Design a protein around this ligand. Structure first.
Ligand SMILES: *CC(=O)N1CCC[C@@H](c2nc3ccccc3s2)C1
Ligand SMILES: *CC(=O)N1CCC[C@@H](c2nc3ccccc3s2)C1
Lengths: 304, 304
Protein backbone atom coordinates (compact mmCIF):
# COMPACT_ATOMS: atom_id res chain seq x y z
CA UNK A 1 0.00 0.00 0.00
CA UNK A 2 0.88 3.70 -0.28
CA UNK A 3 1.22 5.46 -3.65
CA UNK A 4 4.37 7.59 -4.29
CA UNK A 5 5.66 9.79 -7.17
CA UNK A 6 8.29 7.19 -8.17
CA UNK A 7 11.21 7.53 -10.65
CA UNK A 8 12.94 4.60 -12.42
CA UNK A 9 16.26 3.60 -10.81
CA UNK A 10 18.89 6.00 -12.29
CA UNK A 11 21.89 3.56 -12.25
CA UNK A 12 21.80 2.73 -16.02
CA UNK A 13 21.63 6.50 -16.97
CA UNK A 14 24.23 7.56 -14.28
CA UNK A 15 26.70 5.34 -16.25
CA UNK A 16 26.08 7.45 -19.43
CA UNK A 17 26.51 11.04 -18.06
CA UNK A 18 29.69 13.00 -19.03
CA UNK A 19 30.91 16.64 -18.88
CA UNK A 20 31.11 18.57 -22.22
CA UNK A 21 33.09 21.86 -22.35
CA UNK A 22 33.29 24.11 -25.45
CA UNK A 23 35.50 27.17 -24.70
CA UNK A 24 34.20 28.39 -21.30
CA UNK A 25 30.65 26.87 -21.65
CA UNK A 26 30.16 23.56 -19.65
CA UNK A 27 27.02 21.33 -19.61
CA UNK A 28 26.21 17.57 -19.47
CA UNK A 29 26.42 14.98 -22.28
CA UNK A 30 24.95 11.50 -22.82
CA UNK A 31 27.62 8.85 -23.82
CA UNK A 32 26.01 5.83 -25.66
CA UNK A 33 28.35 3.52 -27.63
CA UNK A 34 31.04 5.84 -29.20
CA UNK A 35 28.77 8.95 -29.51
CA UNK A 36 28.27 11.76 -26.91
CA UNK A 37 24.95 13.65 -27.32
CA UNK A 38 24.72 17.23 -25.93
CA UNK A 39 22.72 20.43 -26.58
CA UNK A 40 24.37 22.35 -29.50
CA UNK A 41 24.23 25.65 -27.45
CA UNK A 42 27.43 24.35 -25.75
CA UNK A 43 29.09 26.32 -28.67
CA UNK A 44 27.45 29.71 -27.67
CA UNK A 45 30.17 32.05 -26.23
CA UNK A 46 28.37 33.94 -23.38
CA UNK A 47 27.59 36.80 -25.89
CA UNK A 48 25.79 35.15 -28.90
CA UNK A 49 23.03 34.07 -26.38
CA UNK A 50 20.37 36.09 -28.35
CA UNK A 51 20.50 35.32 -32.15
CA UNK A 52 22.96 32.42 -32.80
CA UNK A 53 23.50 30.98 -36.33
CA UNK A 54 24.64 27.51 -35.17
CA UNK A 55 25.92 26.47 -38.63
CA UNK A 56 28.25 29.54 -38.76
CA UNK A 57 29.27 29.22 -35.04
CA UNK A 58 30.11 25.52 -35.71
CA UNK A 59 32.46 26.26 -38.71
CA UNK A 60 34.83 27.88 -36.05
CA UNK A 61 34.80 24.66 -33.87
CA UNK A 62 37.02 21.53 -34.28
CA UNK A 63 36.98 18.01 -32.68
CA UNK A 64 39.68 19.28 -30.21
CA UNK A 65 37.52 22.31 -29.14
CA UNK A 66 35.03 19.88 -27.48
CA UNK A 67 36.36 18.62 -24.12
CA UNK A 68 34.62 15.42 -22.97
CA UNK A 69 35.32 14.13 -19.45
CA UNK A 70 33.86 10.80 -18.16
CA UNK A 71 34.68 10.57 -14.45
CA UNK A 72 38.14 12.21 -14.22
CA UNK A 73 39.37 10.74 -17.60
CA UNK A 74 39.13 12.69 -20.92
CA UNK A 75 37.59 11.09 -24.07
CA UNK A 76 39.26 11.72 -27.49
CA UNK A 77 36.75 13.37 -29.96
CA UNK A 78 37.35 11.96 -33.53
CA UNK A 79 34.28 13.60 -35.15
CA UNK A 80 31.33 16.02 -34.58
CA UNK A 81 28.02 16.83 -36.36
CA UNK A 82 24.83 18.81 -35.75
CA UNK A 83 21.47 16.92 -35.88
CA UNK A 84 18.70 19.52 -35.34
CA UNK A 85 19.44 21.14 -31.87
CA UNK A 86 21.95 18.48 -30.55
CA UNK A 87 25.62 17.74 -31.17
CA UNK A 88 26.82 14.16 -31.68
CA UNK A 89 30.52 13.92 -30.68
CA UNK A 90 32.19 10.72 -32.00
CA UNK A 91 34.67 9.55 -29.31
CA UNK A 92 37.35 6.82 -29.92
CA UNK A 93 35.99 4.69 -26.95
CA UNK A 94 32.57 2.96 -26.66
CA UNK A 95 30.91 3.60 -23.25
CA UNK A 96 31.55 0.22 -21.48
CA UNK A 97 28.34 0.83 -19.39
CA UNK A 98 26.11 1.58 -22.50
CA UNK A 99 22.76 -0.10 -21.58
CA UNK A 100 20.24 -1.42 -24.10
CA UNK A 101 18.66 1.86 -25.24
CA UNK A 102 16.25 3.43 -27.74
CA UNK A 103 15.52 7.08 -28.55
CA UNK A 104 11.73 7.79 -28.49
CA UNK A 105 9.72 11.03 -28.98
CA UNK A 106 6.92 10.93 -26.34
CA UNK A 107 3.45 12.59 -26.62
CA UNK A 108 2.03 15.15 -24.14
CA UNK A 109 0.76 13.41 -20.95
CA UNK A 110 3.62 10.84 -21.03
CA UNK A 111 5.64 10.61 -17.80
CA UNK A 112 9.43 10.05 -17.58
CA UNK A 113 12.25 10.24 -14.97
CA UNK A 114 14.90 13.04 -15.14
CA UNK A 115 18.47 12.49 -13.84
CA UNK A 116 19.41 16.15 -13.08
CA UNK A 117 23.23 16.49 -13.58
CA UNK A 118 25.97 19.16 -13.05
CA UNK A 119 29.44 18.83 -14.73
CA UNK A 120 28.42 15.27 -15.83
CA UNK A 121 27.75 14.32 -12.15
CA UNK A 122 24.15 13.27 -11.30
CA UNK A 123 22.66 15.20 -8.26
CA UNK A 124 19.08 13.84 -8.14
CA UNK A 125 16.21 11.98 -9.91
CA UNK A 126 12.55 13.11 -10.22
CA UNK A 127 9.41 11.98 -12.13
CA UNK A 128 8.03 14.34 -14.85
CA UNK A 129 5.32 14.54 -17.51
CA UNK A 130 5.49 16.20 -20.94
CA UNK A 131 2.79 18.93 -20.45
CA UNK A 132 0.08 19.53 -23.10
CA UNK A 133 1.87 22.86 -23.93
CA UNK A 134 5.12 20.76 -24.51
CA UNK A 135 6.89 22.18 -21.42
CA UNK A 136 7.98 20.19 -18.31
CA UNK A 137 7.85 21.51 -14.72
CA UNK A 138 11.43 20.52 -13.93
CA UNK A 139 14.00 21.45 -11.31
CA UNK A 140 17.11 22.73 -13.17
CA UNK A 141 19.89 25.19 -12.17
CA UNK A 142 22.67 26.59 -14.44
CA UNK A 143 24.91 23.77 -15.82
CA UNK A 144 21.94 21.27 -15.79
CA UNK A 145 21.69 21.35 -19.64
CA UNK A 146 22.14 17.87 -21.24
CA UNK A 147 20.39 16.22 -18.25
CA UNK A 148 18.06 13.56 -19.86
CA UNK A 149 14.53 12.21 -19.33
CA UNK A 150 13.99 8.46 -19.75
CA UNK A 151 11.72 5.47 -19.23
CA UNK A 152 13.13 1.94 -18.43
CA UNK A 153 11.45 -1.23 -19.92
CA UNK A 154 13.19 -4.03 -17.85
CA UNK A 155 16.83 -3.41 -19.04
CA UNK A 156 16.16 -1.07 -22.08
CA UNK A 157 16.44 2.73 -21.48
CA UNK A 158 14.10 4.69 -23.81
CA UNK A 159 15.59 8.22 -23.78
CA UNK A 160 12.76 10.71 -24.48
CA UNK A 161 14.15 14.14 -23.37
CA UNK A 162 17.33 16.28 -23.20
CA UNK A 163 17.30 19.57 -21.20
CA UNK A 164 18.00 22.90 -23.07
CA UNK A 165 15.89 25.89 -21.88
CA UNK A 166 14.22 27.68 -18.96
CA UNK A 167 11.38 29.95 -20.18
CA UNK A 168 11.11 33.33 -18.35
CA UNK A 169 8.12 31.78 -16.39
CA UNK A 170 10.53 29.14 -14.90
CA UNK A 171 9.19 26.09 -16.82
CA UNK A 172 11.50 23.95 -18.98
CA UNK A 173 11.85 23.22 -22.72
CA UNK A 174 13.94 20.45 -24.29
CA UNK A 175 14.47 18.14 -27.28
CA UNK A 176 14.13 14.43 -28.01
CA UNK A 177 17.52 12.68 -28.64
CA UNK A 178 17.33 13.57 -32.39
CA UNK A 179 17.45 17.20 -31.15
CA UNK A 180 13.90 18.21 -32.17
CA UNK A 181 12.33 20.48 -29.50
CA UNK A 182 9.06 19.37 -27.94
CA UNK A 183 6.63 22.15 -29.00
CA UNK A 184 7.44 25.51 -30.67
CA UNK A 185 10.59 26.26 -28.53
CA UNK A 186 14.01 27.27 -30.01
CA UNK A 187 17.53 27.30 -28.36
CA UNK A 188 17.50 31.16 -28.46
CA UNK A 189 17.39 33.80 -25.62
CA UNK A 190 14.08 35.28 -26.86
CA UNK A 191 10.56 35.95 -25.41
CA UNK A 192 9.03 32.45 -25.70
CA UNK A 193 5.58 32.10 -24.07
CA UNK A 194 4.19 28.62 -23.30
CA UNK A 195 0.50 28.02 -24.11
CA UNK A 196 -2.30 26.83 -21.77
CA UNK A 197 -1.03 24.21 -19.28
CA UNK A 198 -4.12 21.95 -19.33
CA UNK A 199 -4.63 19.02 -16.87
CA UNK A 200 -3.98 15.52 -18.33
CA UNK A 201 -7.52 14.10 -17.75
CA UNK A 202 -6.50 10.42 -18.44
CA UNK A 203 -3.64 10.66 -15.81
CA UNK A 204 -6.05 12.19 -13.19
CA UNK A 205 -8.42 9.21 -13.78
CA UNK A 206 -5.57 6.61 -13.42
CA UNK A 207 -4.53 8.38 -10.15
CA UNK A 208 -8.22 8.29 -8.91
CA UNK A 209 -8.08 4.51 -9.64
CA UNK A 210 -4.70 4.33 -7.76
CA UNK A 211 -6.50 5.93 -4.75
CA UNK A 212 -9.48 3.51 -4.71
CA UNK A 213 -6.85 0.66 -4.91
CA UNK A 214 -5.12 2.16 -1.75
CA UNK A 215 -8.29 2.75 0.36
CA UNK A 216 -8.98 6.50 -0.27
CA UNK A 217 -12.60 6.15 -1.60
CA UNK A 218 -14.45 9.18 -0.02
CA UNK A 219 -14.81 10.80 -3.51
CA UNK A 220 -16.61 7.79 -5.15
CA UNK A 221 -20.08 9.26 -6.01
CA UNK A 222 -23.43 7.58 -6.95
CA UNK A 223 -23.38 9.16 -10.49
CA UNK A 224 -22.23 8.33 -14.02
CA UNK A 225 -21.83 10.52 -17.15
CA UNK A 226 -21.17 10.27 -20.95
CA UNK A 227 -17.90 11.10 -22.78
CA UNK A 228 -19.68 14.13 -24.38
CA UNK A 229 -21.14 15.45 -21.07
CA UNK A 230 -17.89 14.82 -19.09
CA UNK A 231 -15.95 16.65 -21.91
CA UNK A 232 -18.11 19.87 -21.60
CA UNK A 233 -17.03 19.89 -17.88
CA UNK A 234 -13.33 19.13 -18.77
CA UNK A 235 -13.27 21.98 -21.35
CA UNK A 236 -14.62 24.47 -18.71
CA UNK A 237 -11.89 23.37 -16.15
CA UNK A 238 -8.92 23.38 -18.64
CA UNK A 239 -8.78 19.56 -18.70
CA UNK A 240 -7.68 17.74 -21.89
CA UNK A 241 -10.53 16.00 -23.78
CA UNK A 242 -11.13 12.28 -22.93
CA UNK A 243 -11.10 10.08 -26.09
CA UNK A 244 -12.23 6.43 -26.44
CA UNK A 245 -8.45 5.63 -26.50
CA UNK A 246 -8.15 7.05 -22.93
CA UNK A 247 -11.17 4.91 -21.81
CA UNK A 248 -9.65 1.77 -23.44
CA UNK A 249 -6.23 2.43 -21.75
CA UNK A 250 -8.04 2.72 -18.33
CA UNK A 251 -9.87 -0.63 -18.97
CA UNK A 252 -7.59 -2.77 -16.73
CA UNK A 253 -7.85 -0.32 -13.74
CA UNK A 254 -11.64 -0.28 -14.35
CA UNK A 255 -11.51 -4.13 -14.36
CA UNK A 256 -9.43 -4.47 -11.16
CA UNK A 257 -11.56 -1.94 -9.21
CA UNK A 258 -14.98 -2.77 -10.76
CA UNK A 259 -15.56 1.00 -11.30
CA UNK A 260 -16.62 1.75 -14.93
CA UNK A 261 -14.37 4.46 -16.49
CA UNK A 262 -17.45 6.73 -17.07
CA UNK A 263 -18.53 6.34 -13.40
CA UNK A 264 -15.01 7.53 -12.36
CA UNK A 265 -15.44 10.39 -14.93
CA UNK A 266 -18.63 11.45 -13.01
CA UNK A 267 -16.63 11.35 -9.70
CA UNK A 268 -13.94 13.62 -11.25
CA UNK A 269 -16.70 15.95 -12.60
CA UNK A 270 -18.10 16.37 -9.02
CA UNK A 271 -14.53 16.99 -7.61
CA UNK A 272 -14.03 19.70 -10.26
CA UNK A 273 -17.55 21.14 -9.64
CA UNK A 274 -17.37 20.95 -5.78
CA UNK A 275 -13.59 20.94 -4.95
CA UNK A 276 -11.98 18.84 -2.16
CA UNK A 277 -13.79 20.70 0.73
CA UNK A 278 -10.40 20.59 2.61
CA UNK A 279 -9.92 16.79 2.18
CA UNK A 280 -6.99 14.99 0.47
CA UNK A 281 -6.56 12.02 -1.94
CA UNK A 282 -3.32 10.00 -1.53
CA UNK A 283 -2.08 12.88 0.69
CA UNK A 284 -2.71 15.52 -2.04
CA UNK A 285 -5.05 18.61 -1.84
CA UNK A 286 -5.15 18.80 -5.69
CA UNK A 287 -5.77 16.23 -8.48
CA UNK A 288 -2.40 14.67 -9.63
CA UNK A 289 -2.03 14.36 -13.46
CA UNK A 290 1.67 13.07 -13.60
CA UNK A 291 0.90 9.31 -13.25
CA UNK A 292 -0.11 7.53 -16.50
CA UNK A 293 -2.42 4.49 -16.47
CA UNK A 294 0.76 2.40 -17.32
CA UNK A 295 2.48 4.06 -14.26
CA UNK A 296 -0.43 3.08 -11.85
CA UNK A 297 -0.50 -0.58 -13.03
CA UNK A 298 3.35 -0.68 -12.58
CA UNK A 299 3.26 0.66 -8.98
CA UNK A 300 0.06 -1.29 -8.06
CA UNK A 301 1.73 -4.61 -9.31
CA UNK A 302 5.49 -4.29 -8.33
CA UNK A 303 6.98 -4.49 -11.89
CA UNK A 304 10.87 -4.35 -12.02
CA UNK B 1 14.20 27.21 -11.21
CA UNK B 2 11.42 24.76 -10.32
CA UNK B 3 11.45 22.76 -7.07
CA UNK B 4 10.86 18.95 -7.26
CA UNK B 5 10.59 16.09 -4.71
CA UNK B 6 14.02 14.70 -5.68
CA UNK B 7 15.67 11.37 -4.68
CA UNK B 8 19.44 10.69 -4.70
CA UNK B 9 20.62 8.75 -7.77
CA UNK B 10 19.99 5.03 -6.94
CA UNK B 11 22.98 3.56 -8.91
CA UNK B 12 25.25 2.96 -5.86
CA UNK B 13 22.38 1.18 -3.92
CA UNK B 14 21.12 -0.76 -7.05
CA UNK B 15 24.60 -2.44 -7.00
CA UNK B 16 23.95 -3.72 -3.42
CA UNK B 17 20.44 -5.29 -3.79
CA UNK B 18 20.14 -9.14 -3.75
CA UNK B 19 17.34 -11.74 -3.39
CA UNK B 20 17.16 -13.69 -0.06
CA UNK B 21 15.01 -16.86 0.13
CA UNK B 22 14.46 -18.89 3.35
CA UNK B 23 12.19 -21.91 2.61
CA UNK B 24 9.32 -20.39 0.56
CA UNK B 25 9.70 -16.80 1.95
CA UNK B 26 11.53 -14.37 -0.49
CA UNK B 27 12.46 -10.69 0.18
CA UNK B 28 15.37 -8.30 -0.63
CA UNK B 29 18.83 -8.12 0.99
CA UNK B 30 21.59 -5.48 1.11
CA UNK B 31 25.08 -6.87 0.10
CA UNK B 32 27.95 -4.68 1.54
CA UNK B 33 31.47 -6.21 1.61
CA UNK B 34 30.96 -9.96 2.47
CA UNK B 35 27.75 -9.48 4.55
CA UNK B 36 24.10 -9.56 3.31
CA UNK B 37 21.65 -7.67 5.58
CA UNK B 38 17.94 -8.67 5.48
CA UNK B 39 14.88 -8.55 7.77
CA UNK B 40 14.97 -11.62 10.12
CA UNK B 41 11.25 -12.38 9.33
CA UNK B 42 12.60 -14.08 6.15
CA UNK B 43 12.66 -17.16 8.52
CA UNK B 44 8.85 -16.98 9.28
CA UNK B 45 7.06 -19.94 7.54
CA UNK B 46 3.70 -18.44 6.37
CA UNK B 47 2.09 -19.73 9.66
CA UNK B 48 4.21 -18.30 12.55
CA UNK B 49 3.24 -14.77 11.25
CA UNK B 50 1.54 -13.94 14.64
CA UNK B 51 3.84 -14.75 17.64
CA UNK B 52 7.34 -15.76 16.36
CA UNK B 53 10.23 -16.57 18.78
CA UNK B 54 13.04 -15.69 16.33
CA UNK B 55 15.78 -17.28 18.49
CA UNK B 56 13.92 -20.66 18.46
CA UNK B 57 12.94 -20.36 14.74
CA UNK B 58 16.63 -19.64 13.93
CA UNK B 59 17.98 -22.80 15.73
CA UNK B 60 16.19 -24.80 12.89
CA UNK B 61 18.01 -22.75 10.12
CA UNK B 62 21.53 -23.39 8.67
CA UNK B 63 23.84 -21.35 6.33
CA UNK B 64 22.53 -23.54 3.41
CA UNK B 65 18.84 -22.73 4.24
CA UNK B 66 19.46 -19.07 3.19
CA UNK B 67 19.51 -18.72 -0.63
CA UNK B 68 21.24 -15.51 -1.76
CA UNK B 69 21.06 -14.56 -5.46
CA UNK B 70 22.91 -11.50 -6.88
CA UNK B 71 21.79 -11.06 -10.48
CA UNK B 72 21.34 -14.67 -11.70
CA UNK B 73 24.40 -16.02 -9.70
CA UNK B 74 24.06 -17.59 -6.20
CA UNK B 75 26.30 -16.44 -3.28
CA UNK B 76 27.70 -19.09 -0.86
CA UNK B 77 26.59 -18.37 2.79
CA UNK B 78 29.48 -19.24 5.23
CA UNK B 79 27.84 -17.79 8.38
CA UNK B 80 24.64 -16.19 9.81
CA UNK B 81 23.70 -14.20 12.97
CA UNK B 82 20.78 -12.18 14.34
CA UNK B 83 21.42 -8.52 15.35
CA UNK B 84 18.14 -7.15 16.77
CA UNK B 85 15.51 -7.54 13.92
CA UNK B 86 17.99 -8.13 10.98
CA UNK B 87 20.00 -11.12 9.75
CA UNK B 88 23.63 -10.71 8.70
CA UNK B 89 24.54 -13.48 6.21
CA UNK B 90 28.33 -13.87 5.75
CA UNK B 91 28.94 -14.73 2.06
CA UNK B 92 32.34 -15.98 0.69
CA UNK B 93 32.49 -13.05 -1.89
CA UNK B 94 32.82 -9.30 -1.17
CA UNK B 95 30.32 -7.22 -3.24
CA UNK B 96 32.65 -5.78 -5.97
CA UNK B 97 30.28 -2.73 -6.24
CA UNK B 98 30.27 -2.01 -2.41
CA UNK B 99 30.30 1.84 -2.25
CA UNK B 100 31.74 3.88 0.62
CA UNK B 101 28.94 3.46 3.19
CA UNK B 102 27.93 4.13 6.80
CA UNK B 103 24.93 2.93 8.82
CA UNK B 104 23.15 5.87 10.56
CA UNK B 105 19.98 6.02 12.73
CA UNK B 106 18.10 9.19 11.62
CA UNK B 107 15.75 11.34 13.78
CA UNK B 108 12.09 12.12 12.96
CA UNK B 109 11.84 14.86 10.26
CA UNK B 110 14.93 13.52 8.41
CA UNK B 111 14.37 12.79 4.70
CA UNK B 112 15.91 9.86 2.75
CA UNK B 113 15.49 8.10 -0.64
CA UNK B 114 13.98 4.55 -0.84
CA UNK B 115 14.98 2.10 -3.62
CA UNK B 116 11.81 -0.10 -3.66
CA UNK B 117 12.90 -3.65 -4.75
CA UNK B 118 11.23 -7.01 -5.62
CA UNK B 119 13.27 -10.30 -5.74
CA UNK B 120 16.46 -8.17 -5.35
CA UNK B 121 15.51 -6.16 -8.50
CA UNK B 122 14.96 -2.39 -8.00
CA UNK B 123 11.57 -1.12 -9.45
CA UNK B 124 11.61 2.57 -8.42
CA UNK B 125 13.07 5.35 -6.20
CA UNK B 126 11.12 7.89 -4.07
CA UNK B 127 11.95 10.54 -1.41
CA UNK B 128 10.67 9.93 2.18
CA UNK B 129 10.79 11.42 5.67
CA UNK B 130 10.88 9.59 9.02
CA UNK B 131 7.52 10.82 10.49
CA UNK B 132 7.31 12.14 14.10
CA UNK B 133 5.37 8.91 14.98
CA UNK B 134 8.38 6.91 13.52
CA UNK B 135 6.40 5.63 10.50
CA UNK B 136 7.12 6.44 6.80
CA UNK B 137 4.43 6.96 4.13
CA UNK B 138 6.03 4.56 1.66
CA UNK B 139 4.91 2.68 -1.43
CA UNK B 140 5.54 -1.06 -0.79
CA UNK B 141 3.86 -4.23 -2.15
CA UNK B 142 4.47 -7.86 -0.97
CA UNK B 143 8.13 -8.92 -1.51
CA UNK B 144 9.36 -5.26 -0.97
CA UNK B 145 10.85 -6.15 2.48
CA UNK B 146 14.63 -5.45 2.70
CA UNK B 147 14.24 -2.40 0.40
CA UNK B 148 16.48 0.32 2.04
CA UNK B 149 16.35 4.07 2.71
CA UNK B 150 19.56 6.06 2.25
CA UNK B 151 21.21 9.47 1.94
CA UNK B 152 24.31 10.04 -0.33
CA UNK B 153 27.14 12.45 0.79
CA UNK B 154 29.18 12.78 -2.51
CA UNK B 155 30.26 9.07 -2.86
CA UNK B 156 29.35 7.76 0.70
CA UNK B 157 25.93 6.02 1.12
CA UNK B 158 24.53 6.51 4.67
CA UNK B 159 21.96 3.69 4.98
CA UNK B 160 19.27 4.81 7.48
CA UNK B 161 16.29 2.43 6.89
CA UNK B 162 15.36 -1.19 5.99
CA UNK B 163 11.69 -2.05 5.18
CA UNK B 164 9.85 -4.64 7.43
CA UNK B 165 6.16 -3.82 8.12
CA UNK B 166 2.89 -2.38 6.80
CA UNK B 167 0.61 -1.28 9.69
CA UNK B 168 -3.14 -2.03 9.16
CA UNK B 169 -3.55 1.74 8.30
CA UNK B 170 -1.20 1.26 5.27
CA UNK B 171 1.82 3.22 6.65
CA UNK B 172 5.26 1.59 6.93
CA UNK B 173 7.57 0.57 9.82
CA UNK B 174 11.23 -0.43 9.51
CA UNK B 175 14.63 -0.69 11.23
CA UNK B 176 18.00 1.03 10.98
CA UNK B 177 20.79 -1.27 9.60
CA UNK B 178 21.56 -2.54 13.17
CA UNK B 179 17.97 -3.90 13.05
CA UNK B 180 16.47 -1.59 15.71
CA UNK B 181 12.93 -0.51 14.70
CA UNK B 182 12.22 3.20 14.43
CA UNK B 183 9.56 3.76 17.14
CA UNK B 184 7.64 1.12 19.17
CA UNK B 185 7.05 -1.30 16.20
CA UNK B 186 7.85 -5.08 16.31
CA UNK B 187 8.19 -7.64 13.41
CA UNK B 188 4.93 -9.34 14.58
CA UNK B 189 1.44 -9.62 12.91
CA UNK B 190 -0.30 -7.79 15.79
CA UNK B 191 -2.56 -4.68 16.21
CA UNK B 192 0.09 -1.90 16.13
CA UNK B 193 -1.35 1.65 16.09
CA UNK B 194 0.88 4.57 15.05
CA UNK B 195 0.62 7.77 17.14
CA UNK B 196 -0.21 11.33 15.98
CA UNK B 197 1.37 12.09 12.57
CA UNK B 198 2.38 15.71 13.29
CA UNK B 199 3.69 18.12 10.58
CA UNK B 200 7.49 18.69 10.59
CA UNK B 201 7.39 22.51 11.19
CA UNK B 202 11.13 23.06 10.33
CA UNK B 203 10.68 21.25 6.92
CA UNK B 204 7.54 23.35 6.11
CA UNK B 205 9.60 26.53 6.79
CA UNK B 206 12.54 25.34 4.55
CA UNK B 207 9.96 24.58 1.78
CA UNK B 208 8.40 28.11 2.25
CA UNK B 209 11.97 29.45 1.77
CA UNK B 210 12.36 27.17 -1.33
CA UNK B 211 9.17 28.84 -2.72
CA UNK B 212 10.31 32.46 -2.17
CA UNK B 213 13.63 31.41 -3.89
CA UNK B 214 11.54 30.15 -6.93
CA UNK B 215 9.18 33.18 -7.25
CA UNK B 216 6.04 31.95 -5.37
CA UNK B 217 5.80 34.82 -2.80
CA UNK B 218 1.99 35.51 -2.54
CA UNK B 219 1.97 34.13 1.07
CA UNK B 220 4.69 36.54 2.42
CA UNK B 221 2.75 38.62 5.03
CA UNK B 222 3.57 41.96 6.79
CA UNK B 223 3.73 40.24 10.26
CA UNK B 224 6.28 38.65 12.60
CA UNK B 225 5.86 36.47 15.73
CA UNK B 226 7.88 34.96 18.66
CA UNK B 227 8.94 31.30 19.09
CA UNK B 228 6.48 31.04 22.07
CA UNK B 229 3.51 32.62 20.19
CA UNK B 230 4.20 30.68 16.93
CA UNK B 231 4.41 27.43 19.05
CA UNK B 232 0.87 27.95 20.59
CA UNK B 233 -0.39 28.05 16.93
CA UNK B 234 1.76 24.97 15.92
CA UNK B 235 0.44 22.95 18.92
CA UNK B 236 -3.21 23.74 17.89
CA UNK B 237 -2.53 22.60 14.23
CA UNK B 238 -0.58 19.37 15.12
CA UNK B 239 2.75 20.92 14.05
CA UNK B 240 5.98 19.89 15.84
CA UNK B 241 7.40 22.57 18.19
CA UNK B 242 10.04 24.95 16.68
CA UNK B 243 13.27 25.02 18.79
CA UNK B 244 16.19 27.50 18.56
CA UNK B 245 18.03 24.61 16.78
CA UNK B 246 15.40 24.71 13.97
CA UNK B 247 15.84 28.54 13.69
CA UNK B 248 19.68 28.17 13.58
CA UNK B 249 19.43 25.43 10.86
CA UNK B 250 17.19 27.80 8.75
CA UNK B 251 19.77 30.66 9.16
CA UNK B 252 21.34 30.28 5.67
CA UNK B 253 17.90 30.25 3.88
CA UNK B 254 16.98 33.30 6.02
CA UNK B 255 20.31 34.88 4.90
CA UNK B 256 19.88 34.14 1.17
CA UNK B 257 16.25 35.38 1.08
CA UNK B 258 16.57 38.24 3.64
CA UNK B 259 13.41 36.93 5.39
CA UNK B 260 13.98 36.50 9.18
CA UNK B 261 13.01 32.95 10.33
CA UNK B 262 10.38 34.42 12.76
CA UNK B 263 8.83 36.53 9.94
CA UNK B 264 8.45 33.29 7.89
CA UNK B 265 6.96 31.68 11.08
CA UNK B 266 4.28 34.47 11.07
CA UNK B 267 3.57 33.73 7.34
CA UNK B 268 3.10 30.00 8.17
CA UNK B 269 0.85 30.96 11.15
CA UNK B 270 -1.45 32.96 8.77
CA UNK B 271 -1.50 30.03 6.20
CA UNK B 272 -2.54 27.68 9.03
CA UNK B 273 -5.09 30.22 10.39
CA UNK B 274 -6.51 31.22 6.93
CA UNK B 275 -5.71 28.23 4.61
CA UNK B 276 -4.61 28.55 0.94
CA UNK B 277 -7.97 30.08 -0.27
CA UNK B 278 -7.64 27.76 -3.36
CA UNK B 279 -4.07 28.90 -4.24
CA UNK B 280 -0.92 26.71 -4.50
CA UNK B 281 2.77 26.99 -3.43
CA UNK B 282 5.30 25.22 -5.71
CA UNK B 283 2.27 23.51 -7.36
CA UNK B 284 0.99 22.13 -4.00
CA UNK B 285 -2.45 22.83 -2.33
CA UNK B 286 -1.01 21.75 1.09
CA UNK B 287 2.17 22.65 3.05
CA UNK B 288 5.01 20.14 2.18
CA UNK B 289 7.01 18.89 5.24
CA UNK B 290 9.29 16.26 3.44
CA UNK B 291 12.12 18.67 2.42
CA UNK B 292 14.71 19.41 5.16
CA UNK B 293 16.60 22.74 5.26
CA UNK B 294 19.70 20.71 4.08
CA UNK B 295 17.51 19.36 1.17
CA UNK B 296 16.45 22.94 0.04
CA UNK B 297 20.05 24.28 0.07
CA UNK B 298 21.11 21.17 -1.96
CA UNK B 299 18.42 21.65 -4.66
CA UNK B 300 18.73 25.49 -4.64
CA UNK B 301 22.60 25.18 -5.19
CA UNK B 302 23.04 22.11 -7.54
CA UNK B 303 25.17 19.93 -5.15
CA UNK B 304 26.29 16.52 -6.64
C1 LIG C 1 21.08 24.92 -19.31
C2 LIG C 1 22.57 25.01 -19.05
O1 LIG C 1 23.05 24.42 -18.09
N1 LIG C 1 23.35 25.70 -19.90
C3 LIG C 1 24.74 26.00 -19.54
C4 LIG C 1 25.60 26.20 -20.77
C5 LIG C 1 25.12 27.40 -21.59
C6 LIG C 1 23.61 27.57 -21.45
C7 LIG C 1 22.98 28.30 -22.61
N2 LIG C 1 21.76 28.74 -22.59
C8 LIG C 1 21.43 29.34 -23.80
C9 LIG C 1 20.19 29.90 -24.12
C10 LIG C 1 20.02 30.44 -25.37
C11 LIG C 1 21.05 30.45 -26.31
C12 LIG C 1 22.28 29.91 -26.01
C13 LIG C 1 22.46 29.36 -24.75
S1 LIG C 1 23.87 28.61 -24.08
C14 LIG C 1 22.96 26.22 -21.21
C1 LIG D 1 7.47 -7.11 3.44
C2 LIG D 1 7.74 -8.35 2.61
O1 LIG D 1 7.97 -8.24 1.41
N1 LIG D 1 7.74 -9.56 3.21
C3 LIG D 1 7.75 -10.78 2.39
C4 LIG D 1 8.37 -11.94 3.14
C5 LIG D 1 7.54 -12.29 4.38
C6 LIG D 1 6.87 -11.03 4.95
C7 LIG D 1 6.56 -11.14 6.42
N2 LIG D 1 5.80 -10.28 7.04
C8 LIG D 1 5.70 -10.60 8.39
C9 LIG D 1 4.99 -9.88 9.34
C10 LIG D 1 5.00 -10.33 10.65
C11 LIG D 1 5.70 -11.46 11.02
C12 LIG D 1 6.40 -12.20 10.10
C13 LIG D 1 6.40 -11.75 8.78
S1 LIG D 1 7.19 -12.44 7.40
C14 LIG D 1 7.73 -9.82 4.64
Amino acid sequence: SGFRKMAFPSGKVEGCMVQVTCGTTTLNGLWLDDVVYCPRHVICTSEDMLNPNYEDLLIRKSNHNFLVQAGNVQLRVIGHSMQNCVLKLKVDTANPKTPKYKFVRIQPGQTFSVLACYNGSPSGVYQCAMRPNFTIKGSFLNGSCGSVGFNIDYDCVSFCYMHHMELPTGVHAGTDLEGNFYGPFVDRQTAQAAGTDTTITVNVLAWLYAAVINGDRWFLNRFTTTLNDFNLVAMKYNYEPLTQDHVDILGPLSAQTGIAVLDMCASLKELLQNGMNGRTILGSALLEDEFTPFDVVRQCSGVT
